[PDB]
Design a protein around this ligand. Structure first.
Ligand SMILES: NC(=O)c1ccc[n+]([C@@H]2O[C@H](COP(=O)([O-])OP(=O)(O)OC[C@H]3O[C@@H](n4cnc5c(N)ncnc54)[C@H](O)[C@@H]3O)[C@@H](O)[C@H]2O)c1
Ligand SMILES: NC(=O)c1ccc[n+]([C@@H]2O[C@H](COP(=O)([O-])OP(=O)(O)OC[C@H]3O[C@@H](n4cnc5c(N)ncnc54)[C@H](O)[C@@H]3O)[C@@H](O)[C@H]2O)c1
Lengths: 282, 282
């Protein structure tokens, strides 16, 4: 029944649903919980280096942090220890801070997305999958996919440097040639031949309306995932549903990254349904 | 219903009752509240300067701090603004942090002790009072006394430099010669002639058993106060009670400094009875 102190270091955090999820679940477990935005574009932490903010959290009794863009790679060398998976991906989103200020990095984007696939696509065929988008979120998603039984993942990005760098990182992490960079041009025919496809681009968001590829390449037998969670039903997922495809919406990763982080931070077993209800209520 | 984040910068804080008081009252008002020790002898904040710790609180979203020994004077020049009373005493125990990291210093030791006198000694005669002890707590107590209608306060300390420096500070703060330093040797006869006496020394504590002066100098007509709050009934207050004297125990200031700080930090009206019950429960 000791109180819990957490925060998120990142940029442009006002609309994040992560603080609310953690504050509600700590309270539901009888533990007063504060989860603060630490926004380097905002009114308190502007102009401060990542190491200053991390050090501050240590000194003033935080039990953990999340880390988001543009800090998930930069944070690694600052930490005392880093999980195998976070090390091999080269990205940390969760920092557990023990009673002395010792830090351990983890990656709950990877574990989160993996859990979403178990929960939402238990019967999906995983032999051949396409992922469109090789940014930050895409890096974690690809890792999750190929450690969760995807045999061959083809990753396309408008920026070829990003897709190949992704492939190299993941293949090293898993010890086999699981991932292949492919061209974005003509991606539809690649998708058509695969078992499933995941959008890991901004397409579908209000400010990026549409889809990353022509949905006419989908068939009823495909499964389709999307990282975008606002709106939950993206134009891509609506097209997929219209055909009868199984779909994996973006709220599953979003919720599970927080479930997994709360467990890491506190040692408590989070209630997934309550954290899901918090998320959807915002 | 925004969560509240507070802490205490000081040394040797494990047994402080202040965190528990604030965490309980925030929760009773429907506001998840974390109040962290920031102990420069402890496992997280050792070796760090006061300015580093204050800055850290700003960056990571604290709504306020308390400040205790040896930092209540040192903190003043670090703050953006300081209350009249805290300025004139030269000591701050409460720092309100607004939404940008702007800081205002206050002194709730002074307001606390004053409120205790109103609550616990409403009918006391205040023409002539003696205070034994001119350290930190004594400085706040003396200020409270002479702004709350004490005409002449005689302050004794084994260290004469401390009693005279106190007198000079307070007399400047209040604009009259309210306080006079007197010798500790022979203080009993000075007490005997006065209306009331306040112990502001460590005497009475478990590790400092006894009294700061011979209690035989007391009469039934005196009132007697003590800053020591463990034990609540000090040897001094037991002697005073034996004669039928009105007494002011040290828990009143301790509780009220926290009541007044919580009001400052949050804008909420604290429930004195609940914060008193938290204090006594520890
Ligand atoms: N569900 C969640 O938990 C969660 C969390 C954070 C972000 N997101 C979502 O993930 C999206 C991606 O985030 P990110 O941080 O990796 O963004 P990013 O901008 O770093 O990466 C997106 C990648 O998509 C590529 N891309 C864009 N359009 C493309 C197209 N038509 N074809 C192929 N590649 C294309 C870009 O070149 C870029 O490399 C965000 O826009 C947001 O909607 C979801
Ligand atoms: N009620 C509260 O809210 C509260 C809060 C903090 C501390 N305290 C109590 O206040 C006490 C004093 O704290 P402080 O920080 O000012 O301590 P301090 O040690 O800075 O000052 C105490 C002063 O007492 C003087 N003194 C000691 N014995 C004396 C004697 N026999 N005659 C005359 N002077 C004597 C010392 O020379 C010293 O200047 C603490 O020991 C603690 O019990 C109470």
């Amino acid at each position: 029944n000791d109180s819990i102190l957490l925060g998120l270091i990142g940029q442009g955090l006002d609309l994040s649903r992560t603080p609310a999820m953690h504050e509600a679940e700590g309270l539901a477990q009888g533990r007063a919980t504060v989860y603060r935005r630490i926004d380097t574009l905002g009114s308190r932490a502007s102009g401060q280096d990542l190491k200053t903010l991390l050090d501050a959290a240590l000194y003033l009794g935080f039990n953990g942090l999340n880390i988001t863009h543009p800090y998930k790679q930069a944070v690694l060398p600052l930490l005392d220890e880093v999980s195998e998976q976070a090390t091999q991906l080269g990205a940390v989103n969760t920092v557990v801070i023990d009673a002395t200020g010792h830090t351990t990095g983890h990656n709950t984007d990877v574990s989160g997305f993996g859990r979403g696939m178990e929960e939402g696509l238990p019967n999906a065929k995983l032999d051949s999958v396409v992922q469109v988008g090789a940014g930050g979120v895409g890096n974690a998603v690809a890792y999750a996919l190929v450690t969760h039984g995807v045999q061959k993942l083809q990753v396309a990005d408008l920026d070829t440097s990003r897709a190949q760098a992704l492939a190299d990182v993941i293949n090293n992490a898993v010890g086999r040639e699981a991932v292949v960079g492919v061209d974005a041009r003509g991606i539809e025919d690649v998708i058509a031949a695969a078992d499933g496809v995941v959008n890991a681009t901004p397409m579908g968001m209000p400010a990026h309306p549409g889809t990353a590829f022509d949905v006419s390449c989908l068939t009823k037998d495909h499964w389709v995932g999307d990282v975008v969670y606002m709106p939950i039903e993206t134009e891509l997922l609506k097209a997929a549903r219209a055909l009868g495809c199984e779909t994996l919406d973006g709220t599953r990763m979003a919720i599970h990254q927080a479930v997994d982080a709360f467990r890491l931070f506190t040692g408590l077993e989070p209630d997934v349904s309550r954290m899901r209800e918090t998320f959807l209520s915002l």
